[model samples]
Structures are given as C-alpha cells and as structure tokens.
Target: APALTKSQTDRLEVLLNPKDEISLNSGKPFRELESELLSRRKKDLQQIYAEERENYLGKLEREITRFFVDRGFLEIKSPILIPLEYIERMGIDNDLSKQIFRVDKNFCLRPMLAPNLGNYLRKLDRALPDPIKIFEIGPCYRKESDGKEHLEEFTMLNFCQMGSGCTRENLESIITDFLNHLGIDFKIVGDDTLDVMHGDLELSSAVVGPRPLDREWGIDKPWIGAGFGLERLLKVKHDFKNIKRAARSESYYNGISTNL
Candidate 1:
C-alpha cells in the first residue's frame, strides 16, 4: 500500500467531507468503511514497535538472568496474592498499607517481594547453602498517585545475600558491579542506606540488616538487600519522559507512540 503523507491524508479527508468533521456525522461511508489513512499508519507504527518492545525486554531479561545465575544465585518465585497477616507481620505502616490492593478480608496483592522472600528464607535456608543468595523479578502493585515515575502495576527485581560477610561494603560492591555489567554509570549516595543512582534518577537502593523488622521474619543472620524497578531502569536508560513508555502500559511500544 502507498503510504499517504500527512498533507495527502488531510486533502483526502477534505475531499470526502469538505469540512473538519467525521464522515459518520455527515452520513457518508468514508471510503466504504475501510480503515482511515492515519489510523492505518499509526497501526503499522504500533506493529513495528511491538516487535521492538519484545526484543528489548527479551534481551534485558536474558542478561539479568545470566548475571545472577552465573554468580551462583537462585531465582525464586512466590504467590502474588498473599495473606493480609504477612503485610501486618512485616510492620508495614498505614500509609504504605493504604496502597495495597486488598483482595478480600484475608488476602491482598503483594506490594513488595521482601516479605514473601523472607518467608521462604525462613524455611528454604535450612536446605540451601550459606549466604542463601536468591533473587526475584516479578510484578508488584500499588495505589500510586498519578505521575510519570509511578505505576500501579510494575516489575521489580529484589536480590539479597544472607550470611556472614553480607555487610554494607559487600552489598555496595555487588550493586556497583551489577550496575557496571548493565553499562550504567552510577553514583552511590547516602551512608547507612545507600541509593545507587544513574544521573539524577535513583535506579536501586541497598541496605545491610539486622533491621528491627528482620526479627519478625526470623532472619537472625547478617544480610544485605537491594531492590530495583525494571521499568525505572529502562526509563532512565532511554531517557523516557514517563515510565509507561518503558513498562507495561496502553500508551506505547518500544518507546514509540503516535500520541506523543
């Protein structure tokens, strides 16, 4: 099909309707009810982006999986809908709890993977090796305020090292190495709890624990953890104005959109 330029499309529309109105409003067929020129062009663009988006995410996932797997870390999965008690046990404050999507009186969609990972660690550590290195990449939900950086449904990568030598320095080293592997030039900010940043955007946060919350989950050993948003990484890497372009959204594919 010959792609019509924008001006050609406008002229065609004018010839059909002779005014700035839809053909349906004038009781006309508008090229026998076929697809409009602009819609067709946009659809083609969407298809191209769909392929690009798939490839982009696939490559990232492979790289991420390899980065951890080659370093002797096990990937884990857990339930998305968890018991309400877990959130309560984790001592999540009211402000954070308000963002949780409650399924019923007893259950709610998980807002973070930490509690679930901790729950598994309580049991799984018995059979696993020392340092119990594990990581998870999955969707989390929140009732976030409307913004470019926040999404109600988004992907997160949570990784932890639990055992002796899992100190703040070690955590920093691991995070920095990972950031380097991802080709992101980062700066570490903060002393106790560090935020790994790329330019002005914070890509990940890390901390060493024996935190007060750890006792609730029976985590007695030294450990360190870092959590990152996959969407945020992609957004910053591509300099996307909104995370929706890099994440699962109705807006665009592969960072391309007609509306923008």
Candidate 2:
C-alpha cells in the first residue's frame, strides 16, 4: 500500500466524511444535549448494536488470550485505578493526573493497560527468566472529542515481551496475522503521512514518547509493546451495516482525554 500523504489523508477524509454524516446525526450537533444525554445515547447504541460488536470483540479477546495463554503467558487482572507513580514512570504522565477523577486516594480511570501491566512484570520476584508474553483485553479511558472512530472509554488490546527471545519482527508478524483475520487491511503509514498527520499523531497519543527513568519510580529491562483500538473496528462495522443505535447511560463509558 502507498504511504499516507496529505493528499491521501484528504482523500480518506472525503471517503470517511459521508459515513460520519450518515451514522451520527450529521445535520446539527445536538447542541443542547447535555453531556449526560450524550452519554445515555451512546450507551443505548452500544447495548443495541453491540451484540454483533461484542461477539466480534469476544472472539478477538478469546483468540488473543488463548494465543498467549497457550504460549505460557500469564493472564493478569490489574487494578484499573493504579497509583500515579507508575503513570509518571511510563512518560505518559503529562496531564494524566489532571484528567483522572479522584477515588479517595486512588485515581478514577486508567487510560492504557501498559503502565499497570508493565509494573506487574517489573515486580516479578522470579529471576528474569525467558521472555514474557503477556496480553490484556479491557476498557481504557481518555478525554477527547467523540465521533465515529473516537471514544473516551473503549477496549484496548496490549501485550509485551521480555527477555531476549521475542523480536520486534515477531511482534509485527503477530499483528499482521491478527489484522488479516479481522480483515482490517491497514497499510503502513509512511513518513509523509507522519509529516502530514503529525498534529494528529501527538493529539491522539498515537506516537508514544519514550518512558524515561526517574529516581522516584525505578525501571527494569525496557519491554516492547503495542495497543490497537476496538472502536475503529466498530466504526467499520457500523459503516458496513449503515445502522446507528443510541447508548444506554451518560455515565457508562465516561469520555475523552481532556487532560492531554
């Protein structure tokens, strides 16, 4: 596939614009709908159309878990409200604190599974023996604009490999097959695409910055990882169906990465 250029991005915008208008009331943004009403609508839609979405996601989540579980990766359920220390360590600390709703001493929502998952691996008492292949399937939050391909609370699939056995190439191979299985058919974004969409890259946290070492929060072997958006899949599916449904409650999948 050709690299994404400004022209290409423009073309994609044109291609996707019609769908955007069709799915989510294109006439006028319900200007008066309070955040609460919007939330209820989205939840309603998810409950209605999500049977198919959930089925697809369930298959995806299951296949992913089975893949890693069969390969000796330990399944873990980390706290959704992790401490601030780990968030800062991951170099994703910028504005993270400001966005989280307080739960007494704990933060409200976790945006990515990386920090908690990586922290767990680092805490392992066992000698860093053979590479670790661990994966997580769950919801994450962010503060941002909501639209066809964007959501504040959405599912994320992330995994990492430790030790020397797993290569980056190996990881790419895995993602390629997964995409093929889902028929996503995404092409590699080119340098020009990066130049053109650089603003978006930073805006959406698509281009992750390096996690630095901090005296406050220590680090171990740097682990390699990746995450893919579940809503993108839903967006494509919605387009395929040309069917739009409202969500249940406003507070359900509380929204965008406002802090960042």
Candidate 3:
C-alpha cells in the first residue's frame, strides 16, 4: 500500500483533521479512502442546507437578547463606525491606534463595543435614571493578524448596568446565570477573573465597578460590564475545528464552508 503524499494529505486537511482514523475495508486503497473523505464535506452541506434555517450567530444573538431583556436589561443599538476618541475613553492611545482599523482621519472602525456603549451611558445617564441596564451586540473590526483563534472582524455582545452596586459576587452571578441559561457547563475562576473559558476557548470576560477608565469618558458610577466573543462561544459549544466556522462569510455558511 502506498502512503498518502504530502499534497494529498494537505488537501484532505481542509475538510478533515489530522490524526483522524479512517476505517478501511480489507485491502481498500488510500486514494479511494481520500476521495470518500473529500466527498463527505458536500454531503455535510446538503444535510445542513435542508435542516438549518438560520446561522447560529443570529440565533445566539436572539437567545442572548431574550435572556437579558427578561432580566430587565434593555437591548440597545450602537454605531459600527465611531470616532477614534470614543476608544480613547478606554485609555487606548497611540498603542491601540496601531491595532485599530482606521477609516480615515478622526474616525475608525470600532475594535470593541465598550467605547460606544460608554458614550451612550454618558449621554443617557440622567434620562435613563439609576440602574441603567443596557446591552448591545454588533460587529467589531481590528487591524490584527488573522489566525485560527483571531478574526480581523467579529461579533461582540457587551452588556452593562450602571448604578448597580459593583461587587465581585454580583458580577459572577450575572455570568453564572447567563452561561447556565445556555446550558454550558463552565468554571467561573480567578478572583474578579474576566476570562470565561471552556478548555482553551475564552467564552467571555467581565469588568466590575467603576474604574479609572470610566472617568476618561466622563462617566462616574458603579457598573458591571461584560463582553463576549460570539464566534468563540459558538466554537466552544459546537466543537468547531476552527474559529472561522462561526464567522460571517459567504464562502463559509455560518461555520461550514462550500469548498471541499
């Protein structure tokens, strides 16, 4: 029996993982088995096409929106492109300016939701009254390198409640309740630990209480904020081989690619 060539192995790697065992009938050839595995991707697409109506990201957004609204958090909207100064509120200076995808002078694509949300909080402060509970989900862009774990653009759901007393216990409860809502078994770790993890994938991270950064946005209050990487969450839940499976793409439907 001839061994699989590097080229053959590289081609198959796109659709299947290395170290996967392929069962062969007695005397079946490697070339035949490789073809079978390659064809499996199209079949997988057909099954998904028949069965799925919505991408998981959209579904996850609705699910998250429902949970927060049910808990009295107002589902809000924010702009995708924002003034660079909005991010400066987070103490991001020339350091972050390098990593931000700038649109031109004075404006750039948002790298995170916190800045705009903070801007919203500052303006809506008095009108919204105390315990101003708000949450928003949208796409964010960055000038970072692409990889298995990194996306130049991705979805983020950021939620915060101002005037709510900030404390470690309360922050954990909010995360605990949300993760439990999704039926994902999670270990909430670190003292005031922001990183939410399931194995190596970080599902979410949280910030509690007033911080020095708040004052940069002219915000002064006790608040709890949490930001989630939507792709990361879906990847963990669905066991996606790569994070791109959960990204927004035409080449890839949700997480499954049209390419074999």
Candidate 4:
C-alpha cells in the first residue's frame, strides 16, 4: 500500500478505534456519537414514516369517507373544546372533568365526539330529512394512562346514523364491511359490539344506541355508531411494540421513529 497522508492515517485510526473524546469522528459507531447518530436516525425514520404513514392514513380515510358518503352520511366538523354542561348532560362530566385538559372551568377539551354529534343531530334532525347520518374525524383528549392503546390526545374517526335504518345489526354490518375492505380481521367480543383486533390489541369498537344516555341529548331515535383510533389502528396494522410510534410526539413522525 502507498504511504498514507497524516490526515488519512488519523481518519483510519478513528474508524478502527473510536475514542470517547473524539466527538468529531463520523466513522465511530452510534454509541460514541449519540447526538449525531440519533439525529440522523430520526431524520431517516421520519422520511420512512412520513411515506408509510401518509399512505396508510390516506387509504384508511379515503375508504372510510367513501363508505359513509356512499351510505348517505354527511361529513361534518365539531368543536374540540366543549362546555362542561355538554359533558355533564351525558353523565360523564363528573368523571371526565378530572381527566379533562381544561380550557377553563366551564369548558374543556372534548374527551369524545358523541356530545358534539348529538348536539348536531338534535338540531339537524328537525331540518334535514329523516335518517340523519353524519361523521367526523378529529382529535379528542383525555388524561389517560400510558399504554399500548391510550394517548392523551388522539385522532378519532366517529360515525353515526339515526332513524329508520339505524339498528344495531346494521351498525355491526357497516363496521364489518369497512374493516374487511382493509383486510382487518375482527370479532364481536362483548355487548354485541365488534372489536377490531390484531392478536391482543383492540383497535376500534362499534355500538348501537338509543343508549340510555342518548335521552339526555333529546335523541330518542335509535342509532348506531363506531369510534376508531387512527394511531392504534396503524400500530396494529404494522405490528408495532408500543403505541408511541403511532402517537403525536417529538420522538415520532406520525407515530413512527427510530428504536432508540
């Protein structure tokens, strides 16, 4: 071999033996260059997750929207911050108040989408034709324990239908058909509700109502509905260990990140 330059020799030495003090050496393994290595890994993971996450979400949202829209459900938006009274009406305000991330004494971030939907249904039913169908996809918040299936703030896809065709069986059929399109295998576990599953992970649930609580919304009509966690669904879809990858956090890009 030809004689090496001093700079080349120094580079070779760093590559073969990464001294703890030589922070500038790019040839060192990640352990010796944590900041740079983690940063690079983060960027790479971000790109990968961005592409994969978008693809998955796009497919899910498109299919969900199409299914409901074809079935005559109108997509709508509702406030994320809601009055305590709204939650109180459902009898969960007392229990939810402690877990709520409050905006004030009177209002808090919505822990679920049902209240908003109910409010709309009460008014919309009077104006629109019979069988009011609506759905919304947005964020809901709760002070939940850290786990595979819970997040403090998470994306929710909620759909509901009321009036003549809103039986529990119809709700089950709608959810089953939608899950089948995504190749998700699920089963009804309890209460005549289907729980979307992958091994032990339960990703979503559907229920039928004129639930006793619906009476408080002035909604006496029978209805059916379902709620899905976008992140949890992706976690199950990809077989992720923890839900953090599918959560909103500095460490993840659309719920994905480097193993570190």
Candidate 5:
C-alpha cells in the first residue's frame, strides 16, 4: 500500500472505512514475538494492563505535552485531591465525599482537570495575559468503578485557552490539523474497522450528554483533547510491516515508524 498523505479527505476515507477490520478486533492482538517480550514481566492481569497503559500514557504524555509546550503553554500541577467546596461552586455543586479519596481534610482526589484550571483562571483573572494557554498532565482518581472506557484511576491531559487572542474554534483547528498530520482518520469514520476499533470518545459523549454541554466541554470527544491512541499507532505500523511487535519496540519505532 502506498503511503497516505496527511490530507483530511484521505484520512477521512480511512477512518470511515479501515481496510484492516479483522486485525483490529479483540481488546488487543498479541503475536508470538510480542507475547514473549511480555512474558519477561510477572504474570498478572492488572500488571499487564498497567504496564501497557502506562507505556501508552507515557508516549502520549510526551507527544501531547510537547504540543502544548511548543504552543507556549506553561505546564502546571493540580492536586488530585481537590476541595469539595470547589467542585460544588463550579456548578456541578454537590458533596464530593462519596466520589473522592481523601488524603487530608483540606483536599480530595481531583476528578477532572477542567474545574481546577477554571478556578485558577478566575483567581488570576485580572493578571492573566491575553491568549493565556495552560497545560497539565497527571493522575486523577474517582471513587467510581472503571468501565471498558473508564478508569477509576487514570492519567489525563488538560489545557485551557483564554484571552481575545484565541477562540475555542482556533484551538479546535490546531487540534484537527495536528491529528490529520499524524495520519489518523480525522474526518472519516472507518465504519467496518471502527466496529473493532473504538469510536472517538468525544463524538460518543456528545451523543450521550446534553447538546450544549457536549458542544461546550466535549464529552463526546474524550479523545479530542488528547487525540491519538499511542500503542495502537504502534500496532498499526507493526501490522503494516507484517511484524508482531508492541510497546517494547519503541526504539525501533523511534526510527522507522516516523519514516512510515
């Protein structure tokens, strides 16, 4: 197969109709060489998922963080254990005691980074420069359980845009172009292949939540803020090369995959 140019029209066609439907089925496919590499680690379900998920998280953290860094956002840390008063004041107001783990009386695990950043903005409202961009990467915890698409404990990437210099629309454009450049199917939904591959979480959230809320703080595109799935991109390359490799092949990918 010839290399697809980084074009929305071309990528859309792939997303709408992926050619490798059979290959993407199952939670994740492992091959002999890939399985052997994993065998070196202790045999445990959580361990396996943790190891792989962290690998994915780490790569994504780097790439995604770099995107923000390159765009002039100063990264900040927001505590996971946020104050209950804060959450309620943000309009999702409620007793957060049941949904959070507490380390001390002053704080609880941060459920989402948005509220923290939002509060920070309000605090610094007067001093903030126009076009202010801020970014954060860290673990968030919830007292809730993990679903197939949810993790009670997971890492997230969050950022915000402020000032007359930028619009959410401008940020959206930058994100769209970024994903398109990564050779992902940005505009098209690969109907057959997506039955195996998960649909974009952002689109899914919009379908399930209030239209206005979805439009404002994208629940549908949970992936929109951080658009790529790191491991799967590696898997896609391995499949294309007819090789059976996984995260351990990062060094190999560091060289060849970029070229691909």
Candidate 6:
C-alpha cells in the first residue's frame, strides 16, 4: 500500500486540528487507513452537532469583560461603520488604507476601535473623572494576507486609558494583568518590529499615546492603549492549528468543519 500524501494526512487531522506531523511508518494497511479517515470524519460531524451552542470565543469574551469591569473599566461598543477621516486619525499608512472596506466615499467598516474609543475618551475625559478606562471587544475588518495569524474579519479587544499617566510600565502592566487573568503562561519579549507575544503567539499589540497622530484627533493627553485579536488568544488557549478554527463562521465552528 502506498503511504498517504501530506495532504491526505492533513485531512486525517482531528477536528480541533493540532499541528502534529503524521507518521506514515506505521505501515498500516491502506484499506484500514482509508476506513479510519471516513470514520473520523463521521465522528466529527456527529460530535459538532451534539455540542452546545455557546463557544470558546463567547466564553473568553465574558471573562474579559468581567476582568475589566472589576478593574474599574467601562465597556464600550462603538459603531462598526466609521467616517473615512478617522482612518487618518488612526494614522494608518496608505498601504493599509487600501485594505479598508470602503462603504462609499465617506464611510468604511472600522479596521480598529481606537478611533471611536479615543473620541469617546476625549469627550469623557473633559466631563468625567480623572482616570477614564474603557475597553471594546467586537468585529474588526482588514484585507490582510497573513493566513497563519490574520483574518479579514476577526474579533478585536481594543482598550484605552486616559487621565492615567502613560508609561511603558503601565501599558505593559495592563496586558500582563489580562494575560494573567486568562491563565496562560505568556512572555512579552522584544522583537525587531515588536509584535507582542503570548507563549510564541503574537496575540496583541500596544501603543502609548501623545503620539504625533494624537494631535490629528485633537487629542493631546497622555494615554495607554492596546489591541487584541480574540481569535489569536483562542488559538493560543485551545492549541488550534488554524486561526479560522477560533473565529465565528458558517464554514467552521469550535475548530470543526461544517462541510463533508
């Protein structure tokens, strides 16, 4: 019997899809392996339908909200469609601007939440108390190409704190605290363009405010901010081989494929 090809072995992967290399040295009979694959596929289909409706992303988001609310932060769900100028306000480059989903001349689906959240903070900063801490977890869109870690549509957890002095320590502390809450042993090491990491996975990115771009928003205060891809967090937590397995989709659920 001929050994299964890499692609064939890939199809034999379990529903949760851990990234393990399949060994063909077992020399099992070809008919036996073929039958095993069919059995596994049927088991996956039955198991998925029998599973509950609630999912890992939903559960993790609740944990996140609980973590922040207890830390004295307000949760904000900003409009998904934002004005074109806010892209400039976010200081994204032209290459990225091309990736935005332009709804028309004036509006586009938001690629990140900070623009709206930042606007809210500026307004709340003037009218409210000294420390304004807020966070948002929702869908964000971008025409990115990094399939291993990028999603055209993905859940983002963007957070901001104004009136609290922005410093390296404070920005990093917020991330460390949240990762601690998630119970994942992670490391925040420095890399050349510095994508923030969790156990070798780049789960999020952080920026300190009073940036040159802040002036564009009419913002001139010290702040700390970070943006997280919830899919990335779920991937790290669940050991998913593909980021799509951790996303909300009609084609896949809880890392299981819907198609036969």
Separate clash counts for every candidate: 0, 20, 1, 2, 23, 0
Q: What is the Å distance of residue 92 in model 3 from its true position?
A: 1.9
Candidate No. with top lDDT: 3
Q: Give stretches of model 4 more than 4 Å off.
A: 1-59, 93-96, 191-194, 254-260
Worst 10 residues of 6 by lDDT: 14-23
**Tens-digit per-residue lDDT, 1-260, candidate 2:** 23345663433332232323433232333332233344544554566565544444555568767766876667777777766555665665546456544455545577788777666666662655666667687877766554544456667777666655445455556656666665655543433021111123211112222245522333355445566655455435333321111111232221211111
Candidate 3 lDDT over 1-260, as tens digits, reads: 76666776655556663234664433556677667776776776787779977778999999999999999888878788888777765676776467888888888888888887887888888698678888999899977664768888899999988886567777788889998888776776543447777876667778886786678777888888889888888877777777877889765665655675
Q: How close is candidate 1 to the true structure, as a TM-score?
A: 0.77
Per-residue accuracy of model 4 over 113-203 as CA lDDT, tens digit each: 9889888889898899878899988789989765547888888899988887888678878877877776777776653456656667766
In candidate 3, what residue range of length 10 has the lowest lDDT sum? 17-26
lDDT (C-alpha) at residue 43 in model 4? 68
Candidates in order have lDDT scores of: 0.74, 0.50, 0.78, 0.71, 0.46, 0.77
After best superposition, candidate 5 residue 149: deviation in angstroms? 1.1
TM-score of 4: 0.75
Candidate 5: where are CA atoms >4 Å away? 1-54, 93-98, 103-106, 123-125, 165-168, 181-183, 187-200, 203-260
TM-score per candidate, chains pooled: 0.77, 0.58, 0.88, 0.75, 0.52, 0.86
The regions of model 2 sitting more than 4 angstroms off are: 1-56, 92-98, 125-128, 145-148, 190-211, 214-218, 237-260
* Tens digit per residue, CA lDDT, model 1, 4-122: 55664444443231122444433434453234644654665677766644545556666787898888778988898888888889876556667889999899988888998897777
Residue 186 error, candidate 2, Å: 1.7
In terms of lDDT, model 6 sits at: 0.77
Model 1 alpha-carbon drift over 4 Å, by segment: 1-55, 93-95, 258-260
Single out the weakest 10-residue window by summed lDDT for candidate 4.
11-20
